[PDB]
Design a protein around this ligand. Structure first.
Ligand SMILES: N/C(=N/Cc1ccc(Cl)cc1)SCCCc1c[nH]cn1
Lengths: 261, 231, 55, 337, 219
């Protein structure tokens, strides 16, 4: 019985790694893709590449075959998977902010020159924040199954869930609504297509990111685990399969680059 | 085309100096620059090389850590900053020009030089003779020898023939071992085979008297010959 | 228009008096030139790779 | 007017009958005694990058190592085709260029376009840079192409329906060639440098004598306007390409058409043509984004050169016959051997 | 490596040339290019003047944007050999005259409409929007008191008033678009008093920029 499940799990990991390797190859082959948006798409692809290589394989036998691994692997695995998941979300927020400045103020966005250093600064800031929101609060766990120890107090789960899930949803919704209002003022077809696409993006993000945070914070309040917990835990990782399909693949420069190969 | 230097004079043991060169009349920021040295009674010795865009710097073996080379494009000026002097550094210094791309002619214009007086895997080039007496109307040949093959896999051969008349700066006669320079009369030529080369002059005239030199440019450092005298 | 007609007519007169020969003669000459120098055309007979400047 | 037009018709009848009189044999009946060349395959050996907009012309040097190209950036670039280095980059005062040329001694270059002026640049100065020696003005329509004869004589063709021979040092014309009705598209000098040919938008070509100015012969036959032209290696024939997807081979002495190159699968026009030494291969660009190779003697064969992603707008062959270069509307030059 | 020293100097030279080419290519893509078109006696001399042989190019700046506008009226050749090189331009300005609704060359207005139809549906300009200017409205307002529009529009059955005539004419220009899903058409009644013309052109260009950005991101 375990065989087929591990088979499917490995299949998903392979699909993820291929899906992001394609984007990295497309960026590195071509030289005309030195825009800000392409930098940010590269950052997102890099961050979501490693999840399909590291986190899932080590997790396979941890719950299918054998815990002969101890803490020296547990701490590594928890820190890596929390870092990667958080970096992916902040990359999404950054892409949305860039797309907003595209249409809020177009004249000032056409005539700015910076092209190397500030962009690298922004990416490094993304990674620094993505570490600093988890690392210090996960390493200092002392009472810690291979799970973080601060589950023993649910209000630390409340602060961590709030700061990492509530704010990004608000920001994405606000930026997308401002895009719609900027455009709207066969016109009806254009308006409906724009509304549909923005709704799709925001809906997919919120659906993939809400249920595990909510279920964890409500369960740890009093009930200090059924199949529902496992389906929510796996739903967090399913985002990284979808992220390359929406943002890189809807742009047109990247589409031409892909067609050249 | 004009290169004018300054900075020479008398220096006590120790001490330091800064020699400067000023260009006027050409696109200074496209030419690599060299400093070259001549002893009071001896041959010439390469000193320093600075590239275009200030990317590359090369020094001689007996100056590293003592001499520093610098350029400035907005005012077209060259500097050599030199410290910790000794009695073996009394000589004259010349500043020379070069430009590299497919078909160009390095070492074409030489400055006027200035005087400074204080109170190995290299390749060897040997000027076989020392002095030759001749009479106008005849033809002459001079030769010098090398210690290694100068021909390269791409077909080039980096030997240069220079002339120096009495009381003047040198000028380029033959560059890259067979090709004729710009403004030189059509009665000089040169050839040679591996490690042994021969220049030839036909119908010697007046003011064609002085010291001839042969240099190699295969790899750094750059080595000059002993110096031939024709009279 | 009379001048234009005169120019056209005189040009036609000059072009009509032009010496002509058999077309097969031109075909034979093209034959000869194409076959006499074909031993020196590097795009028909591939040159050995050692002496190729473009590998 | 009536009598003059009638006599013109009579003269045209005389010309047509003279042309049809000696047409005894054709190429296809006597070329069946030669083996076909076979499949021809060529590979990209080098690739030259650096232009940003479309590329409109190029020209080989006579040492078969140096190259010049022109694009609508407002840039003229000189390439070393052995190591893909750049020797010179020259900026322009008007970016709507359509032609360039490379002096046979190797000292000068030329350019022009939609501004009615031909500019001539000096490459070997004592100050290290490249400067504009001469500006030739006097046409009223755009320029199509220009070709040096030597250091002091140049030839230009315009959209005025006129060609002109210029003396560079003086700056004034010496002889003007008129007689076309539509725009002149291209010209090609003779190897012995005494005549040339010119094709126009009226679907006709004419042969010009340089030192007197009288048109000697005229040729018709295409269904639409003409786009490219060149000489056979011996200077005794020429080939034309047009906008109706056909190529044609004419001979001067026979004074009529010799042969046609067309296929059913092609519907686009021809943008440039060129020959090879033995005259056994004819290279032609197209709008299908790729180039074809035809066997001149048989006209029933082809090789294909693909790898561009837009219209192939220029191509050329060296003097020693050991390479081919193409440039297209997507900013990349490619070298094949 | 298997190179001499002179060849390494050559390589340095090539890299410097590449750096300069890239800098200039970045610099020359931040400016708005406009192509100017009209008919004979279209009144576009005022359009050229009020906006701050061969081709004639002019430059100006407004609100931190750099405009280059190309006037090509002096070329006297067929446009098929010449028009493809303006393919990448950002917008086309088109000038017409209202006062000439009854003159004869057959009619001025009819040939102006044929020209507009010719360049509004061409395959090189399937994605470029068009700005339209209506000139010399004052003489038109003075002339309508004498001759009705039926002299040129026999099927027109409205008032002989200025507003109805102007709206009518604007409608039979804006009707000619066959690509309403891809490109829009802007119109303006040329005021020859102040600097409203530049403001109109600036707003139209800003809209073109915004919609191009949104189109590119697949949104
Ligand atoms: N940035 C992250 N936030 C989600 C989150 C935030 C707060 C709480 Cl209390 C729980 C979950 S990563 C936490 C691990 C999610 C994961 C990795 N593998 C499978 N599921």
């Amino acid at each position: 019985t375990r065989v087929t499940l591990a088979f499917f799990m490995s299949l998903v990991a392979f699909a993820i790694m291929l899906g992001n390797a394609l984007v990295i190859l497309a960026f590195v082959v071509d030289k005309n893709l030195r825009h800000r948006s392409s930098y940010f798409f590269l950052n997102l692809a890099i961050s979501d590449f490693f999840v399909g290589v590291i986190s899932i394989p080590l997790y396979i036998p941890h719950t299918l075959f054998e815990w002969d691994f101890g803490k020296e692997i547990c701490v590594f695995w928890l820190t890596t998977d929390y870092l990667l998941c958080t970096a992916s979300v902040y990359n999404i927020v950054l892409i949305s902010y860039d797309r907003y400045l595209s249409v809020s103020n177009a004249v000032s966005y056409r005539t700015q020159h910076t092209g190397v250093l500030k962009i690298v600064t922004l990416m490094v800031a993304v990674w620094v924040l993505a570490f600093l929101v988890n690392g210090p609060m996960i390493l200092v766990s002392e009472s810690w199954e291979c799970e973080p120890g601060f589950f023993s107090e649910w209000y630390i789960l409340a602060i961590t869930s709030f700061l990492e899930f509530v704010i990004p949803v608000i920001l994405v919704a606000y930026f997308n609504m401002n895009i719609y209002w900027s455009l709207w003022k066969v016109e009806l077809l254009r308006a409906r297509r724009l509304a549909k696409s923005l709704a799709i993006l925001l809906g997919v993000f919120a659906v993939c990111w809400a249920p595990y945070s909510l279920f964890t914070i409500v369960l740890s309040f009093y009930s200090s685990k059924s199949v529902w917990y496992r389906i929510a835990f796996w739903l967090q990782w399913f985002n990284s399969f979808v992220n390359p399909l929406l943002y890189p693949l809807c742009h047109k420069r990247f589409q031409k680059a892909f067609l050249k190969i | 085309v004009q290169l004018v230097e300054s900075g020479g004079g008398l220096v006590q043991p120790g001490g330091s100096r800064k020699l400067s060169c000023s260009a006027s009349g050409f696109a200074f920021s496209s030419f690599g620059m060299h400093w070259v040295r001549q002893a009071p009674e001896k041959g010439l010795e390469w000193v320093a090389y600075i590239s275009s865009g200030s990317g590359t710097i090369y020094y001689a073996d007996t100056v590293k850590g003592r001499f520093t080379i610098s350029r400035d494009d907005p005012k077209n000026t060259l500097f050599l900053q030199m410290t910790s002097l000794r009695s073996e550094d009394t000589a004259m210094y010349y500043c020379v020009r070069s430009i590299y791309y497919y078909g160009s002619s390095p070492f074409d214009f030489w400055g006027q030089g200035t005087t400074l007086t204080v109170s190995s895997a290299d390749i060897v080039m040997t000027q076989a003779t020392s002095s030759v007496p001749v009479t106008p109307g005849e033809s002459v040949s001079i030769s010098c020898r090398s210690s290694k093959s100068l021909l390269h896999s791409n077909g080039n051969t980096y030997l240069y023939w220079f002339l120096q008349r009495p009381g003047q700066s040198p000028q380029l006669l033959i560059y890259r071992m067979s090709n004729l320079a710009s403004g030189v009369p059509d009665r000089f030529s040169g050839s040679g085979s591996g490690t042994a080369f021969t220049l030839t002059i036909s119908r010697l005239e007046a003011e064609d008297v002085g010291v001839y030199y042969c240099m190699q440019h295969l790899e750094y450092p750059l080595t000059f010959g002993a110096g031939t005298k024709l009279e | 228009s009379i001048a234009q007609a005169r120019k056209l007519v005189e040009q036609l007169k000059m072009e009509a008096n032009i010496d002509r020969i058999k077309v097969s003669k031109a075909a034979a000459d093209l034959m000869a030139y194409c076959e006499a120098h074909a031993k020196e055309d590097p795009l028909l007979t591939p040159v050995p790779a050692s002496e190729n400047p473009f590998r | 007017l009536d009598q003059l037009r009638q006599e013109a018709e009579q003269l045209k009848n005389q010309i047509r009958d003279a042309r049809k009189a000696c047409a005894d044999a054709t190429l296809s009946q006597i070329t069946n005694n030669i083996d076909p060349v076979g499949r021809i395959q060529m590979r990209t050996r080098r690739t030259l990058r650096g232009h940003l907009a479309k590329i409109y012309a190029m020209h080989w040097g006579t040492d078969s190592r140096l190259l010049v190209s022109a694009s609508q950036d407002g840039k003229l670039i000189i390439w070393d085709s052995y190591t893909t280095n750049k020797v010179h980059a020259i900026p322009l005062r008007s970016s709507w260029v359509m032609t360039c040329a490379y002096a046979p001694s190797g000292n000068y270059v030329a350019c022009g376009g939609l501004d009615n002026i031909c500019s001539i640049y000096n490459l070997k100065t004592r100050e290290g840079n490249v400067r504009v020696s001469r500006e030739l003005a006097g046409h009223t329509g755009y320029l199509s192409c220009c070709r040096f004869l030597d250091d002091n004589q140049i030839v230009t063709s315009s959209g005025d329906t006129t060609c002109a021979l210029w003396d560079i040092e003086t700056g004034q014309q010496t002889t003007t060639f008129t007689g076309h009705t539509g725009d002149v598209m291209s010209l090609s000098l003779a190897p012995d440098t005494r005549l040339f040919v010119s094709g126009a938008c009226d679907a006709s070509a004419k042969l010009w004598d340089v030192r007197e100015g009288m048109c000697r012969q005229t040729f018709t036959g295409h269904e639409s306007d003409i786009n490219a032209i060149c000489f056979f290696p011996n200077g005794n024939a020429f080939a034309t390409g047009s906008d109706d997807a056909t190529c044609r081979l004419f001979d001067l002495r026979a004074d009529q058409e010799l042969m046609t190159y067309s296929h059913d699968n092609i519907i686009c026009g021809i943008t440039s043509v060129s020959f090879s030494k033995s005259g056994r291969l004819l290279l032609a660009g197209y709008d299908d984004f790729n180039c074809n190779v035809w066997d001149a003697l048989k006209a029933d064969r082809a090789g294909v050169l693909a790898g561009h992603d837009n219209r192939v707008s220029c191509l050329g062959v060296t003097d020693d016959g050991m390479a081919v270069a193409t440039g297209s509307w997507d900013s990349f030059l490619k070298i094949w051997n | 490596c298997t190179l001499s020293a002179e060849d390494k100097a050559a390589v340095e030279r090539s890299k410097m040339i590449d750096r300069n080419l890239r800098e200039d290519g970045e610099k020359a893509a931040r400016e708005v290019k406009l192509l100017l078109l009209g008919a004979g006696e279209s009144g576009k001399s005022t359009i050229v003047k009020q906006m701050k042989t061969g081709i004639v190019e002019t430059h100006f700046t407004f609100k931190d944007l750099h405009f280059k506008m190309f006037d090509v009226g002096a070329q006297r050749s067929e446009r098929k050999k010449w028009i493809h090189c303006f393919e990448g331009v950002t917008a086309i300005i088109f000038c017409v005259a209202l006062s000439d609704y009854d003159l004869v060359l057959m009619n001025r207005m009819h040939e102006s409409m044929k020209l507009f139809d010719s360049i509004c549906n061409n395959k090189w300009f399937t994605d470029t929007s068009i700005i339209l200017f209506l000139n010399k409205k004052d003489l038109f307002e003075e002339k309508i008191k004498k001759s009705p529009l039926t002299i040129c529009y026999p099927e027109y059955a409205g008032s002989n008033t200025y507003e109805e005539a102007a709206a009518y004419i604007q409608c039979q220009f804006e009707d000619l678009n066959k690509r309403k899903d891809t490109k829009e058409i802007y119109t303006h009644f040329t005021c020859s008093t102040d600097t409203k013309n530049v403001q109109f052109v600036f707003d139209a260009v800003t809209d073109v920029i915004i919609k191009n950005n949104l189109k590119d991101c697949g949104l």
